[PDB]
Design a protein around this ligand. Structure first.
Ligand code: SF4
Ligand SMILES: O=P([O-])(O)O
Ligand SMILES: O=P([O-])(O)O
Length: 219
DNA sequence: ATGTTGCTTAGTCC
DNA sequence: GGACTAACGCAACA
């Protein structure tokens, strides 16, 4: 199917009852956004369809993409990520606002799970379910040369996608593994506020991941 | 009030 | 693998 079909069918997905419930349950639970409209639906990926770089996240944040409808948009992860994408020369502007004209250059964003999960922790079954969308979505990104896993969950999800063994591909920030066809699998700590605000992942460190991804992608 | 909640990683055990 | 939890730093939240 093409992207239009992907987005249409994805947005109507209700395979995970716990997530179908949670994505709506959180609406109105955060003071700053009470009364505001929430996407509260599966989150389609965003970015350059001809991207050479794929940034693969964990899942929608309750008041992030689950609210705005766009990956990493509206939360602390995006406040950290988007400016760095621009600093690396991979986007039209530093900020991401729903409905704006933000363009990503050579990069596409999505995640392992597409509906907000309780405690930001999807179950193995939920991951297995949404992996079907990963197959469809990644199939629509023919030019990707570098797959960047943001966090352990994201990495394990990509390993499953590529049929790679976890034992041979451990999660460590900066890890780099070869993929068939001269492609690359990179691992980075996730951009979550609890990684960036604690100093586990600094702006310097993540920008480096982006610059390396560009180098490996021929950009 | 100022204590609690919420935002992934690296150890433990099965 | 999968379930459980101590530990970061910060600030919205109550
Ligand atoms: S997480 Fe994925 S598979 Fe599960 S309901 Fe949402 S879109 Fe469907
Ligand atoms: O909701 P966001 O997860 O994609 O940060
Ligand atoms: O945000 P304030 O809750 O402490 O009033």
């Amino acid at each position: 199917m093409d992207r239009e079909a992907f987005v249409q069918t994805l947005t109507a997905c209700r395979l995970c009852p716990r997530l179908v419930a949670w994505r709506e349950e959180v609406v109105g639970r955060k003071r700053a956004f009470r009364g505001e409209p929430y996407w509260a639906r599966p989150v389609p990926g965003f970015g350059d369809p001809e991207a050479r770089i794929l940034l693969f996240g964990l899942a929608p944040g309750a008041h992030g993409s689950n609210r705005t409808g766009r990956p990493f948009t509206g939360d602390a992860s995006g406040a950290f990520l988007y400016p760095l994408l621009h600093e690396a020369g991979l986007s039209s502007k530093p900020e991401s606002l729903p409905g704006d004209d933000l363009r990503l250059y050579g990069v596409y964003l999505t995640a392992a799970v597409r509906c907000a999960p309780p405690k930001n922790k999807p179950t193995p079954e939920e991951l297995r379910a949404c992996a079907r969308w990963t197959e469809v979505e990644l199939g629509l990104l023919p030019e990707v040369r570098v797959y960047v896993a943001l966090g352990r969950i994201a990495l394990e999800a990509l390993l499953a996608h590529f049929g790679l063994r976890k034992s041979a591909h451990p999660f460590r920030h900066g890890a780099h593994y070869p993929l068939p066809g001269g492609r690359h699998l990179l691992a980075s700590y996730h951009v979550s506020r609890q990684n960036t605000q604690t100093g586990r992942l600094t702006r310097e460190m993540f920008l480096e991941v982006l610059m390396e991804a560009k180098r490996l992608a021929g950009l």
